[PDB]
Task: inverse folding
RNA sequence: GCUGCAGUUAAAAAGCUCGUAGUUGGAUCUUGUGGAGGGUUCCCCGCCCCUUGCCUCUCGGCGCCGGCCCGAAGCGUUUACUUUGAAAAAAUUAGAGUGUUCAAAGCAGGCCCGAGCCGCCUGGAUACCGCAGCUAGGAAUAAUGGAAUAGGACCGCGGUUCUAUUUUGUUGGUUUUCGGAACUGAGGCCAUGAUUAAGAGGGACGGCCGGGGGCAUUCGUAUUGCGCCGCUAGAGGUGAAAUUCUUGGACCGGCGCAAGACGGACCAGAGCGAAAGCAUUUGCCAAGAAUGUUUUCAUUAAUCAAGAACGAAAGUCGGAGGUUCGAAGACGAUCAGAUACCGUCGUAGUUCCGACCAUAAACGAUGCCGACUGGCGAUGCGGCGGCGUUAUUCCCAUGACCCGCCGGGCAGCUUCCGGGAAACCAAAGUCUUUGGGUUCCGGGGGGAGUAUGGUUGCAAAGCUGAAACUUAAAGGAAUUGACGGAAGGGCACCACC
């Protein structure tokens, strides 16, 4: 089956970081997972990552540090309209000061902090902190 | 696990003794072979897991016996791969 | 957990909850109305009746006492209710074949304290309170 | 895993990354085609065809010495069958079961297994028939099973 | 309990599987540079092929010197989503202003002059309004779309047919022309059109494997009965007895025959089956798992109301059979009583064939599918490799034993993985840092699986299933005591010998 790919992905890197690891193997490589981890890399929670290529769908390998505490998925994907936002981020984050809800908009995939400056609502995907 | 092990670059057969679809790239574990048996003097090429009787045009008319795995040869000789 | 979290599963949620709400005790009394039909009250806070005759009602163990209740028939149903009488000597201020005003104990369906079979008490005899009869700031109007 | 058994298992074929020729080989695209057409005359069906090439002839597979699959080559001629062999092999099995069932009415195990293989036909049929690979009026019955397998 | 519950044992996963609706569903189809706004690349015009995709034009303006250029007109396959507008009765609510004597309110009010100003100034905002509908922008995400038995491109031509009403000043007879439309052939031009094959599924192929199932067939010993032979007095049975059996002789020993039942030891934290279940031989009939594969198909899937198959034992109906055991029943004991435990006898039943019945502690008391996360030694099956021995023709091919590796299967051991109320559990783990998919089901203890109506059944009953009234506890795990006609040690002439 593997109904939702992204939802199975994050639990590995969540589990792996707890035990004390710094290399993982996540499959089967969706484009959606790439742009997620790109945003998550900029802020600094993970390091550079290598995309292995296969014809089947690829495999991805990540280098990570203890800075991450947990990245979760939120499924199914609800809408946000920039007044629903404040209610979401209260429940899902440890603090106002830091933590980053991610979402996708027509202006691309980004954190919530950026979307507020573009006046774009959209569909929420996950979170991390 | 020592819980710090590399996974980018594996050992030549100490981390490529694994199941073939649990490797980083999927490889077959099979090969071809350029055979020239001495009852059918022709350069035949045959797959390792024959799955079926390979016939001969010489005095003989059998070259392989299929089994549950690699097919054993009746009296044949000359193994190549070549390369793959 | 252990249940659907679809995006188009509003029907399967809102029909399930509407069924499993009936297993609650409270909800099942309110909405069937079997409460109203079975009760000697119409849901009214009080009710009025006429005395039938005094009784003595024994207590549940460990306690032993005689509790001096009454038994009353109602005006608007004609059915019978057994009603407690409060403080000492207030029994005497209730006289047989007069009207009284009844009221629930304060537990809203269940028998209270060590007295069984009683679910109601008495507040006014004839436009005069048990208090003023007891304390002595009023007298019997007869 | 399995769709009418509880089991789970891996035995799937695994192809190499490469895909050249590779170098060592012969029988240009065209040579492979006439090599195939002869086989389909003899009643060798597309699955069998690729096997009998792979085991004793120089091909790795007939998808890297041609730009098409084994089946599409046969279909372009018009010499393809009117139903897929996959559907045929399901129906082929279930008739013998029904024969054994008439000869022995106390083999409840066979009766049970027939329900599986029966329902597996109907599911497969509902793939093809929506895709306009079968007539939208064709159904599976005892009578139509008898005639279509012959 | 959507946010946000629980189901091993506390209330609780349909006996099991199939299956339509419903819900849910893998991967894959574009990036860099000057100017402008913000950093030191990066986010309105353009450029590589594209850039708000095009043309075709013609009517009504803008231009520059008849000729030429660019805005408005058809639109980019369709929707969800998101963003901007329009359109939304008041009061209420939020909320701006205002000194109601303060406030609840209210919508007012505030200024300078003796009146001699015949007046001045100012408020009565703003927000919100599920949906659905209307409007414009975005193109990520989620659905939908095209040429594979070819038609896309160009004034490319032919063949064929219909039709438009304009002009030769006008009006009538004729004929082409032009425009629109419809249909047919042969030929150019396209890089002339197919994404991969999921550590998803289906299907073929190969060699094996198993108390899997059906049908036929074969065999063993015992038990009981019968016949015959031999010896003589007790035999059965229990804690102790007795019923009962016995010189026409039992029990016991020997020999042969018949009937029905049944597959020991070997037989195991072993195997197969969806579950219920499945062990003598041999053959036949159809079926299935796992593994091997550089074969085939190309998303064909997951879970499931309706509906469907199988489903222990007992029971019911009709036939066959009836050794053994045996509800019922008749006796003998034990007991104050003893309709029981124990002994003897014994019907139904137990067995087979054909119909019914649908229930169990149908228990791992633990839904199914998928992902991730410790260590170690075994066992059954397949495949792969080997330094080693042995079996046969000295052989090779191979079997047996030895060692290691890779799959999937029944299980075990180990611990500050983590969880749990604890017992315990590599899952019952990855849960207040709560969301992978989906079905079923639970709400204090009784009343009650009763009442009632529906439905199925020949019968027995099964499924579906309340309330009145009553009560403050019922229940789970664990700990300390006491107790035990529980187990192992030790001790006493207030215990015994």
Result:
């Amino acid at each position: 089956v593997r109904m939702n790919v992204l939802a199975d992905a994050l639990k590995s890197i969540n589990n792996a970081e707890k035990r004390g690891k710094r290399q993982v193997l996540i499959r089967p490589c969706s484009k959606v997972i790439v742009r997620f981890l790109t945003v998550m890399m900029k802020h600094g929670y993970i390091g550079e990552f290598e995309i292995i290529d296969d014809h089947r769908a690829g495999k991805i390998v990540v280098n990570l540090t203890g800075r991450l505490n947990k990245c979760g998925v939120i499924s199914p994907r609800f809408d946000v309209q920039l007044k629903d936002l404040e209610k979401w981020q209260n429940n899902l984050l440890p603090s106002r000061q830091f933590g980053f809800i991610v979402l996708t908009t027509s202006a691309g995939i980004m954190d919530h902090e950026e979307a507020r400056r573009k006046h774009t609502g959209g569909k929420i995907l996950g979170f991390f902190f | 696990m020592p819980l710090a092990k590399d996974l980018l670059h594996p050992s030549p057969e100490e981390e490529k003794r694994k199941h073939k679809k649990k490797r980083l790239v999927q490889s077959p574990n099979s090969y071809f072979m350029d055979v020239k048996c001495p009852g059918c003097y022709k350069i035949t090429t045959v797959f390792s897991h024959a799955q079926t009787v390979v016939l001969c045009v010489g005095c003989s008319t059998v070259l392989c016996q299929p089994t549950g795995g690699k097919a054993r040869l009746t009296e044949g000789c000359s193994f190549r791969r070549k390369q793959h | 957990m252990g249940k659907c979290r679809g995006l188009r599963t509003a029907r399967k949620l809102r029909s399930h909850r509407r069924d499993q709400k009936w297993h609650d005790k409270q909800y099942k009394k309110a909405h069937l109305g079997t409460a109203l039909k079975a009760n000697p009250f119409g849901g009214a806070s009080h009710a009025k009746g006429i005395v039938l005759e005094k009784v003595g009602v024994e207590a549940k163990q460990p306690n032993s006492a005689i509790r001096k209740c009454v038994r009353v028939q109602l005006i608007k149903n004609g059915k019978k209710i057994t009603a407690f009488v409060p403080n000492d000597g207030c029994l005497n201020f209730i006289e047989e074949n007069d009207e009284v005003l009844v009221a629930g104990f304060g537990r809203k369906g269940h028998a209270v304290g060590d007295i069984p079979g009683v679910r109601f008490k008495v507040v006014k005899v004839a436009n005069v309170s048990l208090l003023a009869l007891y304390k002595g700031k009023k007298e019997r109007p007869r | 895993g399995r769709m009418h058994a509880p089991g789970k298992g891996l035995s799937q074929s695994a192809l190499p990354y490469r895909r050249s020729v590779p170098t060592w080989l012969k029988l240009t695209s065209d040579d492979v085609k006439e090599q195939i057409y002869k086989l389909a005359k003899k009643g060798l069906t597309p699955s069998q065809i690729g096997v009998i090439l792979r085991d004793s002839h120089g091909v790795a597979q007939v998808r890297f010495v041609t730009g098409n699959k084994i089946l599409r080559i046969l279909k372009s001629k018009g010499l393809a069958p009117d139903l897929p062999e996959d559907l045929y092999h399901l129906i082929k099995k279930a008739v013998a079961v029904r024969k054994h069932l008439e000869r022995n009415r106390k083999d409840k195990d066979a009766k049970f297994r027939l329900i599986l293989i029966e329902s597996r036909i109907h599911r497969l049929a509902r793939y093809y028939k929506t895709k306009r690979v079968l007539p939208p009026n064709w159904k599976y019955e005892s009578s139509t099973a008898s005639a279509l397998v012959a």
In short: Chains B and C do not touch (no CB pair under 8 Å). The two ends of chain B are 32 Å apart (CA to CA). Residues 1, 3, 17-23, 26-32, 47-52, 65-75, 84 of chain B lie near RNA strand E (CB under 10 Å from a C1'). The CA atoms of residues 36 and 43 of chain B lie 5 Å apart.
